[PDB]
């Protein structure tokens, strides 16, 4: 009946894995099959794809500094996740994880998505600042779900070619 096992220490814990919370893996899934997705999130890493999460998102930045680039009242403002920090994201806000420092280590801690709620990923552009691309998904694994979301972005120009300007995108690296 305790399907998801006995409490453990977090801090030795994110020790022992502390060679997954760096590239390429970057994170890690506390407890499989929950309800509510409890990760930790290292560095380093940034990256150019917004999140339109339909639900909210608890961050707790337990280790280092991070920042989340964000869409806020239509302007591109930046939430500063210094260490010791805890932010609530709400519904639908765009937001793009940026998480420059090595041996960092922040909870997220989200919920499963039901049938029919959609997450958005999306790209914009460096120029005119329009939407340049969205991919919505039905998010199951966050791993076999997501890298060929991106891959698929960064190796066509026509999905990186903002309708408005026509700047193609940078795609991996800003
Ligand atoms: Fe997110
Ligand atoms: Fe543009």
Redesign the pocket.
Known sequence: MLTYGAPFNFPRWIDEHAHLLKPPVGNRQVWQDSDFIVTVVGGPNHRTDY?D?PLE?FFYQLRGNAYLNLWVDGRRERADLKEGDIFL?PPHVR?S?QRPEAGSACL?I?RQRPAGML?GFEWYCDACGHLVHRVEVQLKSIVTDLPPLFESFYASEDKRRCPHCGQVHPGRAA
Do not use: G, S
């Open positions: 999140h999460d998102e994201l937001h994880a997220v989200e997450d």
